[PDB]
Amino acid sequence: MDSYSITNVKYLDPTELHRWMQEGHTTTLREPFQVVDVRGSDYMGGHIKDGWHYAYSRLKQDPEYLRELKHRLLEKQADGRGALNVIFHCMLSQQRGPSAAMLLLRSLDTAELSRCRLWVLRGGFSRWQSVYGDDESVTAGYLPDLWRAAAA
Numbered sequence: 001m002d003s004y005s006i007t008n009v010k011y012l013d014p015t016e017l018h019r020w021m022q023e024g025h026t027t028t029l030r031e032p033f034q035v036v037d038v039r040g041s042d043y044m045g046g047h048i049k050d051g052w053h054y055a056y057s058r059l060k061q062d063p064e065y066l067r068e069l070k071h072r073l074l075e076k077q078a079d080g081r082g083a084l085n086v087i088f089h090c091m092l093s094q095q096r097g098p099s100a101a102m103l104l105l106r107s108l109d110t111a112e113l114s115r116c117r118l119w120v121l122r123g124g125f126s127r128w129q130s131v132y133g134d135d136e137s138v139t140a141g142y143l144p145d146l147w148r149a150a151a152a
Contacts, residue, residue, distance in 0.1 A: 001105070001113045009101045012087060012119045014128050021049070021138050026085055031117075033085040034076060036069070038100045039125070042091045046129055046142035056096045059103055070107050077115050089121035089128075097124065 001008045020026050020033055035051030037043060043053055059066045077084035090097045097120040105118060132138050
């Protein structure tokens, strides 16, 4: 990235993330990626496989928590190819997704700006599960019952 502007935050569709997961890296530059689920208690009911769970509320209130995430991400990037593609997502298409990305972006030094690419998954986990919810290879801890529209 080149600056600390909101325009540096990119958006990804579920179909493209799924493709990255199938291949094990991004399609264009073959770079690594890491999903960061920033939901709180609404994390319940299923999540993207191999993603990390860092609640937005705590990232925003605890600088040490944000620092921990940054450190983990950069540590993973150091042993990988090129820049690490970090993907943030919420439950739905919410403002907390890009806000979480901005929190990380603002915590990066000018030297670390080039080590990451920031993305937000359009639609959140809600859109994700409507398509890949029952796909065991990309979704973990899924509870079909909770997402039933016309249940009990």
